[PDB]
């Protein structure tokens with residue numbers, strides 16, 4: 001069996017824990033519990049490949065940062081600053097990995113909310129510059145939660161080629 005080490009990064013409160021908890025335990029946590037360094041493991045079938053997902057839910061670990069094979073760079077569509085911080089998280093990932101091509105996926109969370117300040121056009125333009133997919137998600141309605149994590153694994157498969 002193949003293991004995939006995934007790291008979820010992003011500014012505080014964008015929904016990193018809610019996205020991971022939806023993927024692992026299939027429910028939406030409505031309360032805001034401040035995360036330190038939560039880890040998770042889960043057996044799933046992705047495109048027919050049985051694989052283990054080792055997921056670190058970082059706070060807004062250098063071990064997971066060095067061992068991480070793919071990175072979910074998450075922002076909230078109602079949080080302009082979190083979208084701006086994406087550049088800083090990507091630079092740190094490229095720094096600790098010393099690679100200009102690191103498997104990443106850009107996630108715009110909280111797309112169920114009507115208080116948007118980051119347009120879909122902005123995020124797709126940013127993702128186009130990075131050469132990474134962009135997924136709109138809602139941990140509340142579970143929209144795009146599977147697609148976000150599964151697309152990251154496909155990006156890892158493409159990188160391992």
Ligand SMILES: Nc1nc2c(ncn2[C@@H]2O[C@H](COP(=O)(O)OP(=O)(O)NP(=O)(O)O)[C@@H](O)[C@H]2O)c(=O)[nH]1
Nearest residue numbers: 012013014015016017018030035060110138139140
């Ligand atoms: N409406 C809505 N609320 C969401 C969504 N995702 C998370 N939230 C809410 O936003 C708050 C923060 O979510 P959380 O998962 O804790 O964010 P975080 O990125 O893990 N925070 P931290 O970096 O401090 O650990 C919670 O109240 C949660 O219910 C979403 O898709 N839609």
Ligand SMILES: [Mg+2]
Nearest residue numbers: 016017034035
């Ligand atoms: Mg958290």
